[PDB]
Amino acid sequence: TGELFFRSGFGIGMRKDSPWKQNVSLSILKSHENGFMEDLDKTWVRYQEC
Amino acid sequence: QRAVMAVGSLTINEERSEVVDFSVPFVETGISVMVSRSNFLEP
Amino acid sequence: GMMGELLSGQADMIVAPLTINNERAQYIEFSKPFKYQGLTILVKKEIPRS
Numbered sequence: 001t002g003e004l005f006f007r008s009g010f011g012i013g014m015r016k017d018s019p020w021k022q023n024v025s026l027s028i029l030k031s032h033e034n035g036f037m038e039d040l041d042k043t044w045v046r047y048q049e050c
Numbered sequence: 051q052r053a054v055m056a057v058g059s060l061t062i063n064e065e066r067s068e069v070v071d072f073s074v075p076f077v078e079t080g081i082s083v084m085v086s087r088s089n090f091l092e093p
Numbered sequence: 094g095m096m097g098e099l100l101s102g103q104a105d106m107i108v109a110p111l112t113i114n115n116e117r118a119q120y121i122e123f124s125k126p127f128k129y130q131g132l133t134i135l136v137k138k139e140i141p142r143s
C-alpha cells in the first residue's frame with residue numbers, strides 16, 4: 001500500500017582511498033546500458049503476479 | 051576548460067563516464083518510446 | 094554492523110542493497126546506482142467474508 005515516499009536508490013560502497021571507483025562505475029554503466037540489468041530483473045524480480 | 055562546472059539536461063552515457071566526472075543524478079530518465087494511440091464478464 | 098566492518102578494514106567492497114544516505118556518504122563514498130526504489134508500507138492482505 002502507498003504510492004511512494006522518500007524515493008532513493010541502491011549503490012556500492014568503497015573506501016575513499018580505494019582506486020576501484022571509476023573502473024567499477026564504468027562497468028556498472030556498461031552493464032546497465034547493455035541490457036544486463038533488465039535481464040537480471042526479469043530473471044530475479046519479474047515472476048507470477050497475483 | 052571552457053566551463054569547469056556544467057548544470058543542465060546532460061544525458062549520462064558510457065563515453066562521457068571516463069572523459070568527464072559527474073555526481074549522483076537527481077532525476078532518473080532514459081531511453082523511451084512514444085507512439086501515437088490507435089483507435090460480457092469474459093474474465 | 095556492515096558499515097563499521099567496512100570502516101575497520103574487514104571489508105573492501107559491498108555488493109548488496111544499500112540505500113544511499115548523506116551520513117553514509119560523509120564517511121564512505123558510493124558509486125552510481127544500478128536501480129532506484131523507494132520505501133513503501135507492507136500490510137497483510139485479508140479477503141472479507143461478510
Ligand SMILES: Cc1sc2nc(COc3ccc(F)cc3)cc(=O)n2c1[C@@H]1C[C@H]1CO
Pocket residue numbers: 008009010011029032062074075076077078079113124125126127128129
Ligand atoms: C534522485 C535520483 S534519480 C535516480 N535515478 C536512478 C536510475 O538509475 C541509474 C542508473 C545508473 C545511472 F548512471 C544513473 C541512474 C538511480 C538513482 O539512484 N537515482 C536517484 C538517487 C539520488 C541518486 C543516488 O544515486
Ligand SMILES: *[C@@H]1O[C@H](CO)[C@@H](O)[C@H](O)[C@H]1NC(C)=O
Pocket residue numbers: 019020023
Ligand atoms: C582500470 O582499468 C584500466 C584499463 O581499462 C587500467 O589501466 C587500470 O589499471 C584500472 N585501474 C586499476 C586501479 O587497476
